[PDB]
Amino acid sequence: TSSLMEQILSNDNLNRAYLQVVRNKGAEGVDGMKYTELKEYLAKNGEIIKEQLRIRKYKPQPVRRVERNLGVPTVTDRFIQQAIAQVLTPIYEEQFHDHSYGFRPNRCAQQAILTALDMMNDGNDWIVDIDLEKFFDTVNHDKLMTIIGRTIKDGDVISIVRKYLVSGIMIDDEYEDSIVGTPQGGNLSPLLANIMLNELDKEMEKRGLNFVRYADDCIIMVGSEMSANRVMRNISRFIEEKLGLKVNMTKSKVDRPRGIKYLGFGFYYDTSAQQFKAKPHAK
């Protein structure tokens, strides 16, 4: 991974990124450029942008704050972000935990719900529901880049990824309202969050915990109230002390499935089926 920048800038990869970003549509960024204008802009500026990226002179624009609050990158920056993610995603898909489901290829929120239901119906129906503050509002950039740097050795890729953090990329959280569809502004930021939170997945696996995670939204299924309180404390301590993220103490809770709201779903006991099932909760 010492020379990933030229893979990112290859003609095939950039053309795939352009196609995907146009397919994703979305609102315009701070430059007012519509997604239908990207093609003509890159015909004139694509080679200049490649040369700027090669010497770390490309300057991402700040995201446009759009009001749910969204940070929308310019369509040029979504294109570059997508080009970066197309190369890093296969690298990290080999590392990620099978119970991580958010913003990953061939995975979705319903899969996370099904796995959690299997866990609850096996007897692990004490739920540790840890609530985290917004990832990109709180993550330490140096800590994140150090974690990424364990795998990515290409300093040019490290450099532009850091610049996109400063630009304000963030996670579109409409999945919390059970919305299905293409997120806005999420070509790169959800991958970066998964890289950091993959350290949490590894810790929970090391502890033998049953969990599902969707971006920064995790639930842990344990067998007793005493064990649930112990896990709530230990994992909350780990997240704040080792990952430097922030736990919402009042919103985090231990409960039975009936009290959990997760990825827009609630849980209930089906007395005919004699097991827990899930359905969208009232909103």
The residue from 71, 190, 257, 264 that contacts its own copies (CB under 8 A) is 264
Of 142-181, binders to its own copies (CB under 8 A) are: 174, 177-181
Here the tokens at position 200 are 């949490």
Give the span between the Cα atoms of 89 and 252, in whole angstroms: 30
DSSP state of 132: B
The residue from 117, 127, 169, 220 that contacts its own copies (CB under 8 A) is 117
Minimum distance from CB of 184 to its own copies (Å)? 5
Minimum distance from CB of 24 to its own copies (Å)? 8
Contact status: 272 vs its own copies (CB under 8 A): yes
Which three-class secondary structure state does DSSP give residue 260? coil
Q: Among the candidate windows 17-25, 132-140, 203-211, 231-239, which touches its own copies by CB under 8 A?
A: 17-25
279 binds, among K ion, its own copies, none (CB under 5 to 8 A by kind): its own copies
Contact status: 201 vs K ion (CB under 5 A): no
Give the span between the Cα atoms of 114 and 112, in whole angstroms: 5
Chain mean position to CA 260: 21
Contact status: 105 vs its own copies (CB under 8 A): no
**Amino acid occupying residue 73:** P
Cβ closest to its own copies, residue 207 vs residue 279:
279
Cβ closest to its own copies, residue 120 vs residue 191:
120
Minimum distance from CB of 16 to its own copies (Å)? 16
Give the span between the Cα atoms of 228 and 225, in whole angstroms: 5
The residue to which tokens 């330490």 are assigned = 140
Which three-class secondary structure state does DSSP give residue 219? strand
The residue to which tokens 């997120």 are assigned = 183
Binding mask 115-144 for K ion (x = CB under 5 A): --------------x---------------
Which residues in the chain precede a discontinuity of more than 2.5 Å between C and N? 67
Cβ closest to its own copies, residue 233 vs residue 279:
279
Q: Parallel, antiparallel, or unpaired for β 275-280 and 265-270?
A: antiparallel
Tally Cβ neighbours within 10 Å of residue 69. 10
Size of interface with its own copies, in residues (CB under 8 A): 38
Here the tokens at position 54 are 């090669």
129 binds, among its own copies, K ion, none (CB under 5 to 8 A by kind): K ion
Minimum distance from CB of 264 to its own copies (Å)? 8
Which three-class secondary structure state does DSSP give residue 247? strand
DSSP state of 187: S
The contact set with its own copies (CB under 8 A) reads 23-27, 35, 66, 70, 108-111, 113-114, 117-118, 121-122, 174, 177-182, 184, 264-265, 270, 272-280
The contact set with K ion (CB under 5 A) reads 129, 217
